[PDB]
């Protein structure tokens, strides 16, 4: 019901003996895939990221055919309603804590789906699989939380409604980045965790 976990990062020799920990900090795990509904757990190991010194952000990327109906943060707060629904809503601007981007509303510029992909999953040295999800236009929405300052494991629980009844395969991705610390190429350190969920929908 879930493919092997994918973990990639642009962390490199500059991060020394934290490179591998950084590379493997994002995890995604299926919790339920039941009645036209998928629930999963996104975990971010923040312990090597120094977010309490220089803050970071995290991203949840959802595919076509799924619609987020609930997201619960590491404090058990249902933050679903904190995210804008219109990418041009003034509360979706460039230093709000909760931002939303959607391939259907806009692709380019600062609040563009492609732009925010490039600054997140695109930067985490994504594998062919993950790049194929993007080039195949299988992904469509990005939920972003700024001002991450934790130093422990952060776990979020997402629930989404299956909106395409003839689809069984659902890519799930999450990304974390520092907004200050960079790799040897001067790009903000960024890590990705990814997994495809396969349902098999009953017949009758």
Whole-number Å distance between alpha carbons of 27 and 138: 20
Whole-number Å distance between alpha carbons of 29 and 44: 12
- Alpha-carbon distances, residue 16 vs 20, 44, 110, 176, 178 (angstroms): 9, 20, 32, 19, 16
Return the closest-CA partner of residue 70 out of 2, 161, 153: 161
Residue 8, φ and ψ in degrees, nearest 5: -135, 155
| Resolution limit, Å | 2.0
Calculate the CA 177 to chain-centre distance: 11
Cβ neighbors of 171 (< 8 A, separation 6 or more) are: 63, 133, 138, 139, 194, 195, 196, 197
Q: Which residue has the tokens 């395409």?
A: 164
Report which secondary-structure segment, H or E, holds 149. Answer: none
**Between vectors from CA 84 to CA 95 and to CA 131, what angle results, nearest 5°?**
80
Cβ neighbors of 46 (< 8 A, separation 6 or more) are: 25, 56, 148, 150, 151, 152, 153, 154, 176
């Amino acid at each position: 019901q879930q493919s092997p976990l994918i973990q990639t990062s642009n962390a490199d020799y500059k991060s020394g003996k934290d490179q591998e920990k950084l590379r493997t900090s994002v995890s995604i795990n299926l919790l339920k895939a039941e009645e036209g509904q998928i629930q999963w757990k996104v975990t971010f190991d923040t312990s090597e990221w120094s977010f309490n010194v220089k803050h970071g952000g995290v991203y949840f990327i959802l595919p076509n055919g799924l619609d987020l109906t609930k997201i619960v943060d590491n404090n058990q707060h249902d933050i679903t309603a904190s995210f804008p629904t219109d990418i041009n809503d003034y509360r979706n601007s460039g230093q709000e804590k909760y931002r939303f981007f959607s391939s259907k509303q806009g692709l380019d510029n600062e609040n563009g789906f492609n732009s925010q992909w490039n600054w997140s999953a695109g930067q985490a040295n994504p594998s062919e699989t993950v790049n194929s999800w993007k080039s195949g236009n299988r992904l469509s929405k990005i939920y972003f939380i700024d001002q991450i300052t934790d130093t422990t494991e952060l776990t979020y629980t997402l629930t989404a409604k299956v909106t395409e009844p003839n689809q069984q395969s659902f890519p799930l991705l999450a990304v974390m980045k520092s907004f200050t610390y960079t790799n040897s190429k001067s790009t903000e350190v960024t890590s990705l965790g990814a997994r495809e969920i396969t349902l098999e929908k009953e017949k009758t």
